């Protein structure tokens, strides 16, 4: 009670994001205050073929499959074996709750379709070892396991409470045989230690640093980052984003790719953090990285997503009334 | 801020103490004392006497069950010639199981 955390979050966003987006902010603000559209991620382990037919009856369309055929039309590719069904532009229809299949696992998972792009931008390949920092609660973690291109995975999140939610998601969806071995490693440790525990170990690293989540902040009243007690954490939040990304960058082997993802529209936490890590590695550890161009990636998914074309390095997906996916920011940088 | 109190776990019957069937010998968080002769183990690693007699503490060679993967993986990495020892608590029975008594002259 007292001062609502929702209004405090909205006040902070209104001042900051009005300048950044200009006339686009009123359009973004309505989408943020409205409920985000949920995409259906079909579980490959379950009856994926049957569920795909079932979703098409509900007028759902696989945008991922459509984006696959657009690669040759426009003229690293992307992570394969991903099937996500969303509705048409401007359709407010919601998917039914997921149900267990004949195999005992949930048939599909409901998640933001904008959160699949960091997995898609990762360009996952078979036989690789994937490190995910802040993997919990498993929005991006499940997508990596759906691909089946990762022989060894390390899912690390600082909060054990979030980690416990991830394991339950893995148990319900991912069959135990995959989780039985050392293929999926779940730990609760600081990600900044990963820059020293395991250096050059992984070929593909996905770093979704903690950040002020615009969708959750404006709606959730529990553990909001904008409450008075969390003000100290918010002030040091940009510092954490620079350190956690740097640890993930050192963790990968040269010739590997690291994707930095953030669920926010703040430039101080999307572009500045990316530039900070690049400078930090050169100054302290003498590490040089190259940020790839995602413009080719953007032009394929323009049909089902709205993109902001005033970003220095990464790609930002802005929410909209017709396409409510977002906000999502992801940048792919490889180590040389 | 978390507040907790001691669990009062430890040795309940020392060396040479006389115990009866069912008496709890020791309560442990982890297997500090292993069950020996005529000593059972409960769910919470609680040691109770299965027979009435005297409690003895000895050092015995620790040979883990083959099914226990963690303990088998430990002995296989030991240098050749090394032997593991652990403290076992035994109950030495004092009374015989029974005696034959004359009941009739038929």
């Amino acid at each position: 009670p007292k001062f609502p955390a929702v209004r405090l979050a909205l006040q902070n966003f209104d001042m900051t994001y009005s300048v950044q987006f200009g006339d686009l902010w009123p359009s973004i603000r309505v989408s943020l205050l409205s409920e985000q559209k949920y995409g259906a991620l079909v579980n490959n382990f379950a009856a994926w073929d049957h569920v795909s037919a079932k979703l098409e009856q509900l007028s759902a369309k696989d945008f991922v499959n459509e984006a696959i055929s657009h690669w040759e039309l426009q003229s690293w590719a992307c992570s394969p074996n991903l099937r996500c069904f969303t509705f048409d532009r401007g359709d407010i229809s919601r998917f039914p709750p997921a149900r267990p299949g004949s195999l005992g696992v949930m048939e599909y998972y409901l998640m933001d379709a904008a959160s699949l792009l960091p997995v898609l931008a990762l360009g996952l390949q078979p036989g690789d070892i994937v490190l995910d920092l802040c993997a919990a609660p498993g929005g991006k973690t499940l997508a990596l396991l759906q691909t089946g291109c990762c022989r060894n995975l390390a899912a690390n999140d600082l909060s054990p409470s979030r980690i416990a939610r991830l394991q339950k998601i893995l148990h319900s969806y991912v069959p135990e045989e995959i989780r039985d071995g050392n293929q999926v490693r779940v730990t609760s440790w600081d990600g900044r230690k990963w820059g020293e525990l395991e250096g050059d170990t992984y070929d593909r690293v996905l770093v979704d640093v903690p950040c002020t989540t615009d969708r959750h902040s404006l709606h959730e009243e529990e553990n909001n980052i904008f409450k008075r007690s969390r003000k100290k954490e918010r002030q040091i939040l940009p510092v954490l984003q620079v350190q956690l990304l740097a640890a993930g960058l050192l963790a990968t082997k040269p010739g590997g790719h690291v994707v930095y993802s953030t669920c926010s529209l703040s430039h101080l936490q999307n572009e500045y953090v990316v530039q900070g890590a690049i400078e930090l590695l050169a100054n302290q550890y003498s590490i040089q990285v190259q940020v790839e161009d995602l413009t080719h990636f953007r032009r394929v998914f323009m049909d089902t997503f709205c993109f902001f074309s005033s970003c220095q390095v990464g790609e930002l997906v802005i929410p909209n009334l017709m396409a409510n996916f977002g906000p999502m920011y992801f940048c792919k940088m490889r180590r040389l | 801020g978390g507040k907790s109190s001691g669990r009062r776990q430890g040795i309940k019957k020392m060396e040479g103490h006389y115990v009866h069937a069912g008496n709890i010998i020791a309560t442990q968080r982890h297997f500090r004392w292993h069950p020996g002769a005529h000593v059972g183990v409960g769910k919470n690693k609680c040691l109770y006497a299965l027979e009435e007699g005297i409690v003895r503490y000895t050092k015995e060679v620790y040979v883990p069950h083959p099914r226990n993967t963690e303990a088998v993986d430990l002995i296989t990495r030991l240098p050749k010639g090394a032997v593991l020892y652990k403290t076992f608590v035994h109950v030495v029975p004092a009374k015989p199981e029974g005696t034959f008594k004359l009941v009739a002259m038929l």
Binding site: P97, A98, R99, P100, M106 | -
Partner: protein
């Protein structure tokens, strides 16, 4: 604190009236277990009849 599981009551099909409460996932079909019935002193089929509460 989302209610993933619910508490259901299994009623014996032997007609003895013996019933017991078990926990099952909400997103699941009605259970049909093979539980011991003390009245007939043997394992009999049981059927879910009514949900008691959401856990």
């Amino acid at each position: 604190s989302k209610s993933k599981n619910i508490l259901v009551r299994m009623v014996s099909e032997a007609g003895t009236g013996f019933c017991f409460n078990t926990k099952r996932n909400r997103l699941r079909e009605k259970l049909t277990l093979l539980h011991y019935d003390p009245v007939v002193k043997q394992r009999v089929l049981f059927v879910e009849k009514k949900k008691i509460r959401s856990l």
